A paper describes a structure:
Here, we show that a generic and kinetically biased ‘Gembody’ (Gb) interface, previously discovered through trapping in crystallo, can also be trapped in solution by kinetically controlled side-chain-to-side-chain bond formation in a manner that leads to ready generation of complexes; these display ideally balanced interface flexibility and yet relative complex constraints, in turn allowing rapid cryo-EM structure determination, even of small targets. Ultimately, after a survey of in-solution covalent bond-forming methods exploring differing natural and unnatural amino acid residues, we found that Cu(II)-catalyzed oxidation at a pivotal C12 residue site (together with the presence of needed Gb ‘gem’ substitutions previously discovered through iterative X-ray-guided engineering) offered a route to direct and rapid, high-yielding formation of disulfide-linked homo Di-Gembody (homoDiGb) without side reactions (for example, off-site oxidation) to form a robust covalent interface. Furthermore, the success of DiGbs for high-resolution structural solution is enabled by their relatively small mass contribution to the imaged complex while increasing the maximum particle diameter for better particle alignment. In summary, our plug-and-play DiGb strategy improves cryo-EM resolvability and resolution of small proteins through constraint and increased particle size with a simple and robust workflow and can even enable simultaneous structure determination of two challenging targets in one dataset.
Strikingly, within weeks, using an essentially identical workflow to that used for RECQ5 and SPNS2, the homoDiGb method was applied to 43-kDa [name] and even very small 14-kDa hen egg white lysozyme, achieving reconstructions at 2.45 Å and 3.16 Å, respectively. Lastly, we also observed clear structural evidence for covalent bond formation as a driving trapping force for formation of the DiGb complex. In the [name]:homoDiGb structure, there is a unique interface different from those discussed above or any class of nanobody crystal contacts. The side-chain-to-side-chain covalent disulfide bond gives the Gbs a ‘U-turn’ in this joint, enabling the first β-sheet of both Gbs to come into contact but not close enough to form direct hydrogen bonds. Nonetheless, the resulting assembly proved constrained enough for cryo-EM structural determination, with or without local refinement, further highlighting the value of this kinetically controlled approach.
Numbering used by the authors:
A (entry chain B), C (entry chain D): 0 to 124
B (entry chain A), D (entry chain C): 1 to 366
Write the structure that this text describes.
């Protein structure tokens, strides 16, 4: 596996707090055009929370997190970030980082992406 | 490393793993060999990692595009099907599992793009791309739109571009010619010119993407859209009276969407190759096995004819099968990362107006 | 900087729980012989919590964490781990990862090490 | 990028940053140019990163070993001190800051290993290494031990090994000869033979490390130990009646501990070089500046003689200075990562008995 994703920045945050997450991509990542973020509660289906289109900068957000989460990619650092603002207790889950060169379906689907990271845990009380 | 006397099969989590388990139960009832069905997370990266060390499942299920790279790495063993079983599957499906002149896997299911149209807003979908502007003007006279789909994906924009002879990599005698690329040929130039003309004439928006197209179609604002079988559940939930037919032709030539074939590969280090082949040929790739797997999770078009004419009663399945037959089979070599990048850049440049069609296609070719 | 340290695996953990931290070293790390872990409470001096000697496998632990923390290095993965067992509320701090080719003082001193990581945060309630 | 009209100095957090701030206040009172003193975290890593981009502090404080690599990267500007100021500092201190025939930084403080002995258990420390076995036997007759130190560090084991002509890299006319290494010469062979003989004769334990040695000396269980100025505070807390003297000689030749010199470098991209040089020469490197810095944080031996004889009233400072003078100045080239690795492997192999002294030194050399 020449493409690796590492997640960090998950923390214990009260309701209404702000948190940020980072995902570093290493290796031959010149052909990756989609960067997406996924969260998975224990015993729950992995749901798409955000997605980014590298070629044009287009961003995708789910209905539950629209207007609250901001995802951006730093080309000079090869790292994608997601701003977790206005947190609620329902937002606690294991947050994953995903990347894919291309796809035939919606960029908010887990099967859309090929590369997956280890994941980080964010808890909101 | 792989335990003998039993079969281990790894399948993706979006496929029919319970149906695969039922087929394995039938196999163990028939022969006495237990079958284990699993859906490991991150399968696409886990399978090569464990196969490089001589471990992994006896049988692997994945799309045929990665199977070429897997066979290049030596992770797939050669299969030896007889002519009687080969005649049971389609010639293009058999072509999908050919690398270096040797068969490497067994085709299972065939997926391809198809034209999805609204029956209420359009009882008769057009058969040609040239009718789309007139139909769109007629619908705009009623305050609607005819067709908009994902323009941000080369996988979606290829059927129109490569309708009149365009191709990704030249295929001759079971080998793909890397140095021969038809991105900037006359047919692709004409297709991309037609696409950019449609964009400029306000018939379609250059910023339209998958989410916008899907929302517009399920809200009844459009007459046609281009999508695969994966959205059929979404339209069914949206309760839109939709139909699926063959993609419109361009200059009399049928569209050539990319064809993805789900196929069954055998691990090179797996010591249960004989029983795996027997299971695939006589218990999985049968009418009962295919119908069980489809009952668990739909597969769309299938390689077997004995079940393909059975599923042909569904117009959507028939349209998907004919579109796959008329389309371009997806090759299995790593340089299509570069191919996707180049075609995406050319399409964005042509749609955004920064570069002309000829310059964009030349840049993609180079 | 050819040597990079990334800290991950720190999460919101209740009292008495068990947590494992990971620190991945990348680049020209063939000459590093000391791997150390440091924790720093907000507004507090950075204190040494554990240290590892790569050449012989010798380990060092502070008095407050002796018999409770276990630090080990995986050569096949170039990652050093620390097991945070029998947690107490006093253990909350920002945990750092440190590495050094050599040193002239005790391996539990912050000035001993040359390479420093971004740091992971562990909270115990 | 660096703002003109002011001085920015970056210093480590374990040094006298408050004293540096006081010296900067004196400088701004005298001249009208403000001085900013900071103690950034991860200074040794961030300073090259910001200096490679043309930014960073005007003056940098660090040991001279990394200044060679900094000059190789071009992050240090050549200084031009006159002979009057050069005579104020020691010739070996000036040598420690010379690379490629040019002076790159101003020496500030000198640190080196020294022999620390217990006055109560040993009023007269031995002057030779050969007396240590007899002294250890006499102390073991009373249930104590003579000397145990860090055998796990080449930095600590070097003074005994390189006492009789051993050296790391040959130094001639301001240049270090990489191809000339004296790891396996006669002097180093004799020193390592003496060390392994001491280990085998139960006089010292091969597994003894810094923590064990420090605890044993602070608990009064040992008569002597080898440590730098950094352990003086710990011993003072332990209230052990300790003394610091010159390291014992081996075969009549004094020990050669590695010498680390804190030095003042000037950024190449800094446009305030003239005022930085004036500040260093006339306000920092003076008796008042050195005493102001030492009041905040002790510096041990200093490059300036005017402060050096004044500090010489302390026996510990005098012993550290004489040990540094008789020792080996630490060179400043990157290959000593390999040097440390090789010498550490040789020492471990010799002490553990897996390899003989000659084989271990040959392996370290190769």
């Amino acid at each position: 596996s020449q493409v690796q994703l590492v997640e960090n920045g998950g923390g214990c945050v009260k309701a209404g707090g702000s948190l940020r997450l980072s995902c570093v991509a290493s290796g031959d990542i010149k052909y990756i055009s989609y960067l997406g973020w996924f969260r998975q509660a224990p015993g729950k289906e992995r749901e798409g929370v955000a997605a980014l289109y590298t070629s044009t900068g287009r961003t995708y957000y789910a209905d539950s997190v629209k207007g609250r989460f901001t995802v951006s990619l730093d080309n000079a650092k090869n790292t994608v970030y997601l701003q977790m603002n206005s947190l609620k207790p329902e937002d606690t889950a294991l947050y994953y980082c995903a990347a894919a060169e291309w796809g035939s379906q919606s960029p908010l689907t887990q099967w859309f992406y090929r590369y997956w990271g280890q994941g980080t845990q964010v808890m909101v009380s | 490393k792989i335990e003998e006397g039993k079969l281990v099969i790894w399948i993706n989590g979006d496929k029919g793993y319970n149906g695969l388990a039922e087929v394995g139960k039938k196999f163990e009832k028939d022969t006495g060999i237990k079958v284990t069905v699993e859906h490991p997370d991150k399968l696409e990266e886990k399978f090569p990692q464990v196969a490089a060390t001589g471990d992994g499942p006896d049988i692997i299920f994945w799309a045929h595009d990665r199977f070429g790279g897997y066979a290049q790495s030596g992770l797939l063993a050669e299969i030896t099907p007889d002519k009687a079983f080969q005649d049971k599957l389609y010639p293009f499906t058999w072509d999908a599992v050919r690398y270096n002149g040797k068969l490497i896997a067994y085709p299972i299911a065939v997926e391809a793009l198809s034209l999805i149209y609204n029956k209420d807003l359009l009882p008769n979908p057009p058969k040609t791309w040239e009718e789309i502007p007139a139909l769109d003007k007629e619908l705009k006279a009623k305050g609607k739109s005819a067709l908009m789909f994902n323009l941000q994906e080369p996988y979606f924009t290829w059927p129109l571009i490569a309708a009149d002879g365009g191709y990704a990599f030249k295929y001759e005698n079971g080998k793909y010619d890397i140095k021969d690329v038809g991105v900037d040929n006359a047919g692709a130039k004409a297709g991309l010119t037609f696409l950019v003309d449609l964009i400029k004439n306000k018939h379609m928006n250059a910023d339209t993407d998958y989410s916008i197209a899907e929302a517009a179609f399920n809200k009844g604002e459009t007459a046609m859209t281009i999508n695969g079988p994966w959205a059929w559940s979404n339209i069914d939930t949206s309760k839109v009276n939709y139909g699926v037919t063959v993609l419109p032709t361009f200059k009399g030539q049928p569209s050539k969407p990319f064809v993805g074939v789900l196929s069954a590969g055998i691990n090179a280090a797996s010591p249960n190759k004989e029983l795996a082949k027997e299971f695939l040929e006589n218990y999985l790739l049968t009418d009962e096995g295919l119908e069980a797997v489809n009952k668990d999770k739909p597969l769309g078009a299938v390689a077997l004819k004995s079940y393909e004419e059975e599923l042909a009663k569904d117009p959507r399945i028939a349209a998907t099968m004919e579109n796959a037959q008329k389309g371009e089979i997806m090759p299995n070599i790593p340089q299509m990362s570069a191919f996707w990048y180049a075609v995406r850049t050319a399409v964005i440049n042509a749609a955004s107006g920064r570069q002309t069609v000829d310059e964009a296609l030349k840049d993609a070719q180079t």
